[PDB]
Structure 1
């Protein structure tokens, strides 16, 4: 039967099933006030699927100049054409190669650039903004979005949305690498998975994806979405409560020291955006500091709600197109205040 919601992470994560249900706020606001992330499924079914394809981005915008990042070593690939990224998104035989002659796992940096999404892609902008879930929180002018209503004593988010485009991580070695390293934002955010590209050529990399989800600490109900319903998994997230941010900083200062980094005792390893918590580091966080997080698999059309101040990291399983919008909920406005 169709139901309003279900639970993941063994009851610790709300999963809303109908993105446009006018009663979602009633269930949402109880979990959100406690500092929890929330998942909303089915957003892909609300969108115009032809506007979110890698081949369309390449055809319409392919002559723009951009920088890429090599996800394996953080090397920057400067001043290439954006088609050089899009044409290898699913076809592995078309990817830019490293010296070792392997196809690279690439992230497209800052594209569209700064606040230019709405100017560059007005039709995509409309399709996304009109179908965001929890619209009183997430729309630019929603009644529960304080972004447009706050004085300069608060850090205000940039005008969005922002697009996040990157290939999937492939190998056993890749399991310890991030697509986006551990960091935090002083605003709330909603992150929507609008396209998942399962590649071809080196296409059969399905079994390393299962070992990554399993070692990533995903719950048994999350594993049933693949095996029983054949949904497409895009990315593995780990999210931590805002109240645990300082304990994470203490762990990363101890590890930086053990690895012979030479860091002042007060430096901020979360703001530096230099760490990915692999299986070894997640277990140490739990055992040595008492900190548990949420392991979330974001499938096609899942919207991940990330609370202000909550540390988080992202590991692409397959090639992903994500679009995210920032907002300022009244529950979490304390995180962007500039005093005490």
Structure 2
């Protein structure tokens, strides 16, 4: 009856250590009720390696044109999809180089229909299936009529460079934002970049080690079988109002503050860098949870939580609005009353 686990971020996040343990949902249930996020590690061991590599995604889907975003300014880049992928692990092939992201490509029904093998593999591999799989007893997603859920309810593939080559840790690959539904975020591929004098795998490990981490996290990082990809900062949903007030104030101390009653959280315009996070804590006593997402880690966030992401290596993440076996009771009404209003 043992479910291997620990807590990280001063007991804010449950770490389920065994993706293979079929009772994970029993412990998750109790922490989730309290609004605690969770991380399930090792999900890449269930997944089909060959579907999720950059090389295979690039080959299979490289013919579809899409916009590339420069993560520093969120302006659409001149780069096309082929040049994006060419630069994923080869810094010399990048447009100082910039941090590009291919966001939500593909996503929603198109992910399901145009990448059906990946979609099938995702379904088979989702952790906490009672809560995250469409057929889960506790997942309402498939059940709620149209009006009550986000219109974009579905899987999303995101791929982006790490910020390391640009040498600019003020860049977020995912800016601070709120989740309208519960979501699970799986890091499915980590690409080590080379070229143009970029810091090596070992130097990037050192860069991870220089962050303010929990003892538990540093220990994980010492394990050469685990591959760290991205740095996350996660906020409790109950702190949303204070964070918004803080960013508005910071916006006013800059220029920026022309428009009245702008919502910097809705705008998705901020990456809250180290200096700002420190200032936020002092001024509002809002704590930052720091996580490192390693390959195979599935980060499970409740509706209302806020987070931002900064890839260090190149990363491919798949997100699912996160469905749910075993509670034909709880989360089979967060899309039984949520497709619907």
TM-score, structure 1 length as denominator?
Answer: 0.88
CA distance in 1, matches of 2:145, 2:58: 40
1:188 is the counterpart of 2:182: yes
1:141 is the counterpart of 2:139: no
1:88 is the counterpart of 2:87: yes
Please state how far the C-alpha of 1:19 moved relative to its aligned partner: 1.7
Please state how far the C-alpha of 1:93 moved relative to its aligned partner: 2.1
How does 1:13-32 map onto structure 2 within 5 Å? 13-32=13-32
Unaligned runs of 5+ in 2: 325-329
Q: Deviations over 1:179-224 (max 9, x none)?
A: 0100112100000011101112235344663565356432122122
Asked whether the 8 Å contact 1:157–1:187 carries over to 2, the reply is no
Query: Alignment partner for residue 239 of structure 2, among 241, 244, 258?
Result: 244
Partner of 2:322: 327
Partner of 1:309: 304
Query: Alignment partner for residue 283 of structure 1, among 275, 278, 296?
Result: 278
User: Judging changes above 3 Å, is the alpha-carbon distance between structure 1 residues 253 and 228 closer, same or farther for their aligned structure 2 residues?
Assistant: same
Partner of 1:150: 144
Asked whether the 8 Å contact 1:237–1:313 carries over to 2, the reply is yes
CA distance in 2, matches of 1:293, 1:312: 10
1:225 is the counterpart of 2:226: no
> Aligned Cα RMSD in Å?
2.6
Partner of 2:327: none
User: Judging changes above 3 Å, is the alpha-carbon distance between structure 1 residues 229 and 5 closer, same or farther for their aligned structure 2 residues?
Assistant: farther
Asked whether the 8 Å contact 2:145–2:338 carries over to 1, the reply is no
CA distance in 1, matches of 2:183, 2:259: 31
How does 1:51-62 map onto structure 2 within 5 Å? 51-62=51-62
Please state how far the C-alpha of 1:333 moved relative to its aligned partner: 5.0
Greater alpha carbon shift after TM alignment, 126-135 vs 260-269: 260-269
Please state how far the C-alpha of 1:20 moved relative to its aligned partner: 3.5
Query: Alignment partner for residue 118 of structure 1, among 92, 112, 117?
Result: 112
Unaligned runs of 5+ in 1: none
CA distance in 2, matches of 1:253, 1:160: 32
How does 1:63-78 map onto structure 2 within 5 Å? 63-78=63-78
Please state how far the C-alpha of 1:282 moved relative to its aligned partner: 0.7
CA distance in 1, matches of 2:294, 2:282: 30
Please state how far the C-alpha of 1:172 moved relative to its aligned partner: 7.9
How does 1:153-232 map onto structure 2 within 5 Å? 154-156=148-150, 158-170=152-164, 173-201=167-195, 202-206=197-201, 209-210=204-205, 212-214=207-209, 216-232=211-227
CA distance in 2, matches of 1:337, 1:246: 24
CA distance in 2, matches of 1:72, 1:293: 22
More helix as a share of residues: 1
Asked whether the 8 Å contact 2:164–2:199 carries over to 1, the reply is no
Partner of 2:257: 262
Higher relative contact order (CA 8 A, sep 6+): 2
3-state SS of 2:189 partner? strand
Kindly report structure 1 stretches of 4+ aligned residues shifted beyond 6 Å. Answer: none
3-state SS of 1:116 partner? helix
